[PDB]
């Protein structure tokens, strides 16, 4: 199958994981589609000023691929500035967050893979 | 960890899986780092006229997320026009290919998840 991102209605989430402002999440493939091996495959849009709040992953890991804009990725107690083209990897047992510190939308892909 | 795409030296590959022309692949995360749950997380670049040739996947599935450009994704005997923002899903037992039928570069993420 092909899924045209452009044509998936995002869910608007306020204070996602305790973050700032409103964020949009477009689910691109279901976990069932992904044979229960990954539980999330989504495109996130963070308006200027918004963030996904600090939260922990256990028994899984998450990858962000930054698609557009700029911001700051927090992982293992460190802030790292990120931009389009960056991969952010969060391992099992770590906590992370991400904030849009620029003036255009920060978009990225998020994939959570089990165990 | 953060991995900055632009700073990875791609591997140049001619006639990838029997395709046309020469493509570039940047491996972004190793299988090890992904706990042996995925065997590939790469950013591919196809110049116009180039393709990843037809090939079969077994015991795993693969996702392309299109980054830039346009082209044609072949799956289950059908040619499907794709463009930036599209997700291409190839399930286990299926065969796929992708060709840059456009006039600029076609870039995409490829992830192969096991079982
Ligand atoms: O949903 C999550 O875990 C995320 O987006 O980081
Ligand atoms: O090598 C593969 O499986 C691919 O890139 O589609
Ligand atoms: Mn997370
Ligand atoms: Mn393939």
Q: B10 phi and psi, to 5 degrees?
A: -70, 155
- 8 Å CB contact between B113 and B61: yes
Cα distances from B13 to residues B6, B16, B23, B53, B113, in angstroms, run 18, 6, 5, 12, 22
Q: By the CB < 8 Å criterion, does A5 face chain B? A: yes
Instruction: Judge: B35–A82 Cβ closer than 8 Å, yes or no.
Output: no
Please give the distance, rounded to the nearest whole angstrom, from the Cα atom of residue A17 to the centre of ligand 2. Answer: 35
Please give the distance, rounded to the nearest whole angstrom, from the Cα atom of residue A49 to the centre of ligand 2. Answer: 38
With left for phi above 0 and alpha for psi between -120 and 50, is residue A76 left, alpha or beta?
left
CA-closest candidate to residue B54, choices B109, B14, B16: B16
Tell me the domain boundaries of chain A. Answer: 1-115
Residue A6: strand, helix, or coil: helix
Class of domain B1-115: mainly beta
Which residue numbers in chain A precede an interruption (C–N > 2.5 Å)?
Answer: none
Q: Please tell me the distance in Å from A3's CA to the nearest CA on chain B.
A: 5
Method by which this entry was solved: X-ray
Residue B52 CB–ligand 2 contact under 6 Å? yes
Q: B16 phi and psi, to 5 degrees?
A: -65, 130
At what resolution in Å was this solved? 2.0
């Amino acid at each position: 199958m092909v899924v045209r991102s452009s044509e998936i209605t995002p869910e608007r989430i306020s204070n996602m994981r305790g973050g700032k402002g409103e964020v949009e999440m477009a689910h691109l493939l279901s976990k069932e589609a992904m044979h229960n091996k990954a539980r999330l495959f989504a495109r996130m849009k963070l308006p200027p000023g918004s963030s996904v709040g600090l939260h922990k992953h256990e028994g899984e890991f998450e990858i962000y691929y930054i698609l557009l804009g700029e911001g700051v990725f927090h992982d293992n107690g460190k802030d790292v500035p990120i931009k389009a083209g960056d991969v952010c990897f969060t391992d099992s047992g770590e906590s992370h967050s991400i904030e849009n510190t620029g003036n255009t939308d920060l978009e990225f892909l998020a994939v959570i893979i089990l165990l």
